[PDB]
């Protein structure tokens, strides 16, 4: 029904919000050599997935880390330097985060139009019978 | 038979539940910024059983130190859906008396 | 609204603090017997449901 559109579009609104927050944590950790949890932060990605289970909502199935190797930088005098003297920094790519930032915002706003479009159809469907 | 309970069906109770649901969503939006507040959800089937409750919503994302589990994207959509369904319940329950009055008066 | 606003604000705020630490280093180039201060960022995740 038209109410299923609200569930489908609403799921995308939450879905694009997850990717926006993941990108925000990527931009804020692009230069963080250290990290609690004994893990040099690596770029995270939200992998969307259609939950077919007509109406196909979108669900986040889990956040996946980047496969790119960490950026090694020779800083011998740093306390975190290894024997060779290289400290490692996250593999966050700025350009893809900016592209993800644009795409997530554009996709978020176009889901609002569909919810608005379905809202008007239900209101007119209610005016029938009056 | 021929009683208001059977003539009105369950549409006499649904209008009340949609009002309670709207109140809870209004509370969630207002308390979105106050830290420590846990988003409250209302179970529709519970008030269905009460006709013939006030649960907590588990977050999809972690907090940021506030402890507030209100997602404003979800609340707006749930408030829009409840308001649309509330008007339909008024239309359903309103027409119950309009048909009932036409049967009695014959005009 | 969305919590990414404060998630990015909590990152921009720390960049200014890191900038202050580097500013103290350059102000102390002529100082005698001054040991330079290192600046680093720690990644801390908000563990919980979700």
């Amino acid at each position: 029904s038209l109410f299923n559109v609200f569930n489908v579009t609403g799921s995308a609104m939450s879905a694009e919000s997850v990717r926006l927050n993941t990108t925000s944590s990527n931009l804020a950790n692009a230069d963080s050599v250290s990290s609690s949890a004994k893990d040099t932060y690596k770029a995270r990605h939200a992998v969307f997935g259609a939950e077919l289970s007509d109406t196909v909502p979108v669900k986040v199935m889990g956040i996946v880390e980047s496969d790119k190797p960490l950026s090694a930088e020779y800083n011998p005098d740093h306390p975190l330097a290894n024997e060779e003297g290289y400290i490692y920094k996250p593999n966050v790519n700025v350009m893809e985060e900016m592209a993800n930032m644009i795409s997530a915002s554009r996709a978020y706003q176009t889901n609002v139009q569909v919810a608005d479009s379905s809202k008007q159809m239900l209101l007119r469907t209610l005016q029938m019978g009056q | 038979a021929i009683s208001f309970d059977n003539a009105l069906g369950i549409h006499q109770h649904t209008v009340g539940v949609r009002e309670r649901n709207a109140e809870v969503i209004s509370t969630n939006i207002a308390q979105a910024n106050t830290p420590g507040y846990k988003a409250r959800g209302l179970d529709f089937a519970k008030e269905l059983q009460a006709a013939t409750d006030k649960l907590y919503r588990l977050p999809t994302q972690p907090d940021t130190g506030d402890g507030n589990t209100v997602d404003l994207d979800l609340e707006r959509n749930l408030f829009m859906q409840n308001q649309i369904r509330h008007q339909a319940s008024l239309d359903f329950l309103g027409s119950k008396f309009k048909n009932l009055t036409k049967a009695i008066k014959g005009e | 609204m969305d919590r990414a606003l404060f998630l990015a604000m909590s990152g921009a705020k720390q960049n200014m603090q890191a900038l202050q630490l580097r500013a103290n280093n350059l102000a102390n180039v002529s100082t005698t017997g001054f040991r330079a201060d290192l600046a680093q960022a720690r990644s801390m995740q908000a563990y919980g449901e979700g």
Partner: peptide, 17 residues
């Protein structure tokens, strides 16, 4: 759920929680 969700932990050292 029938019980409030727990808050979020943001420790500077996970070993101390």
């Amino acid at each position: 759920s029938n019980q409030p969700p727990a808050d979020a932990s943001i420790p500077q050292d996970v070993a101390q929680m």
